[PDB]
Structure of Ethanolamine utilization protein EutL:
Amino acid sequence: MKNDLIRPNVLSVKIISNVSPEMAKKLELEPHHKSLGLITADCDDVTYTALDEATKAAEVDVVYARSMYAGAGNASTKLAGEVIGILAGPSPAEVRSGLNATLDFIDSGVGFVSANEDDSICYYAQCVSRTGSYLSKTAGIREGEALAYLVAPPLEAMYALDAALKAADVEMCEFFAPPTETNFAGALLTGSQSACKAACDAFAEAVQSVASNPLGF
Amino acid sequence: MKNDLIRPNVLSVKIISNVSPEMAKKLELEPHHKSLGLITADCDDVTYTALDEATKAAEVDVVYARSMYAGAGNASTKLAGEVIGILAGPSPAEVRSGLNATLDFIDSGVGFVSANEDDSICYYAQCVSRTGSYLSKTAGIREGEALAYLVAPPLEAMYALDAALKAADVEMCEFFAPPTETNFAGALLTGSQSACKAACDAFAEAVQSVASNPLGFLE
Amino acid sequence: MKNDLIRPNVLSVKIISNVSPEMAKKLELEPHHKSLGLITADCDDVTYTALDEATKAAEVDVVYARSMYAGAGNASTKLAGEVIGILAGPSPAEVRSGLNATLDFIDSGVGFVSANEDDSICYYAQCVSRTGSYLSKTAGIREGEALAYLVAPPLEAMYALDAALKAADVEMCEFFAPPTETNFAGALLTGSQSACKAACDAFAEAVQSVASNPLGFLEHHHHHH
Ligand code: NA
């Protein structure tokens, strides 16, 4: 129902210790990247946020992260979900710590929110108060600065991004032009923490507005 | 069943009255683009044709138009369909005029056509007699020149395009190599209105022939 | 169930006997490519392997070969499957021979293999003893050399590729980074025939290992969280 949280799920987790040189080459790993932590989940943007959180908690880097075409509901195999993330670190210890931080964040109550009665429109509006090394790089902003991470389906996202930009003193850093691999859209916005928060609130209200009246113009 | 029209549906329409400058920057809008019209539907190629029609009825430009991966049948949310289109114009009234023309066209009886008994193969074979500003740019031709807009599933499209090019006095402008986002394929062909119609008929006939004999190649 | 073969199916096959110049241009065909053979099927990597086998049987080149977004189980039309392949040759007779070889290979018993009880995880671990002109060009090796053709879903593939590279004297030629259009991943590895076989064996074992215990990490390392 409307305002219900859609719980994200982790599907599989594995560690690679002493990664093969051939694989290290193709992933373009650094010399201190000896171990990899692999994760898949059924919700990509929650996982991207959680991987960023991991870079704060442990000496890991996000070296690979991609979404699956047409999203988790169209997965053809059990563990594909709609995202794969790869953390790299100096040892299995640091990679396990990074994976533990990722898992803790994914279970923390964050997620997409339903905008209607059968949960067929949903959105993500997450304020990241202090970015780690992954989302700051993706947005092109300085490490440690705040972001608003806003995602909705294509039309809702375009309409609601406009409302979010008018509601607060925020800049658009990165535009997820529709379609993303999962057929969503959105953006990463930056500004002060309170402005990002304001942007999140306005974004959520605007998506809900479209959901309640999709054809009115 | 065979030759039935598959009716396209509009899922959502919105107008942004005064677009924020941050948005205008990322969409690379021109300074006179003040208002946006947004539309989603469950059929991309009909919608692209309709958006082109809107540019003939009003002073609007198509500034954004993209298809969704794996098509409307695989949509995960209610309003995503398989296409988003964005019109831009100098005012909300002009954008409204453009969207009305888009909706009327989508409702006019155009659409994909079934090639078989359970509608599991379908194609689009549409003669655009006078292109607007969107399809003419896309195809690289003068505004007002004719197009055949031909779309089918991947093998059918390759086979039927060859037939259409042989049957009719037409040139290939743009090739949609398989897969498009929706896992279709096709092309835009130009020529006289008469030749584009003949290309449409030959394309339709060839798609039907593949549907009726999908494994036959020894003759 | 586990170790069952998943049978691949051909959906459509056609020949264009004399290709139009307009189409020849867009496909960037060679001057001696006069005829095209078209094929779709519900399994892409088996079909790519079969197309390579065709280049050994007839005077044909693979000029086009692409997978469909989100795979065959999400196809919206009957004949799209998850792959289209296009063979080109100098005459309909050669294309005809190439397509027959392609069909025969697809029916030969090769395929993806199930990794678990409900066939919800599957993988391809195929030892190509003697590459034709298509896979050799793709991998950057000489025609006739061996390949290990390894495909699985994204996390399984990454884990199992590492196992395969450590199991034998093989080199990574081509890496299919996740996701491919079908949301799989994998690689082409080369080495001697026996090394490619060992790599196939280790890959298959590693995929099965993940399938039977995808979240063991939780018990072992996420305790008291
Ligand atoms: Na589906």
